[PDB]
Amino acid sequence: QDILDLQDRVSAVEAAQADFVQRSDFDALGGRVTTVETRVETVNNSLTG
């Protein structure tokens, strides 16, 4: 019955996995977002002073 109707379902999700994102990749971006978040406030405060 299950001759091999799963050999396809393996590579099936594997193709989508080849794309998606990456933990480190996303994390690097979060650090930059935090740095810019602090930088905006620093610029605002210095210029307001």
């Binding site: 930088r39 406030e41 620093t42 405060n45 210095s46 210029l47 307001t48 002073g49």
Partner: protein
Amino acid sequence: GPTEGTYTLAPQAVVKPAGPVYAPAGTAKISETLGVTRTTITLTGMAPYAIYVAHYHKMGSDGPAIMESRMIAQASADGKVTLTGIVPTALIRDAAYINVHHGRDFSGALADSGVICTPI
């Protein structure tokens, strides 16, 4: 012989900043005498040019602030604020944390809600 060379310039790629690193840090010296308190908060690594209102927040964190303790000052060109204030002891009774904030105006105002705080 006016040796002249004309060169087009490239738009670069590395534009990292050059100046005070916003890394808040400092100490506090609350000194009681004969019923009066003199508080000196010397901070370094702050915003280069910014007003830094600091007062005593009571326990409750949120909590009200005994606004009869607002110490106001501006920073230098490296980020060094020196807050100084005179407050009756009976006023600062039941205070919990000296919270430093950012000042929208030299009249005070809490632009930020606590960039640095010390338990008292």
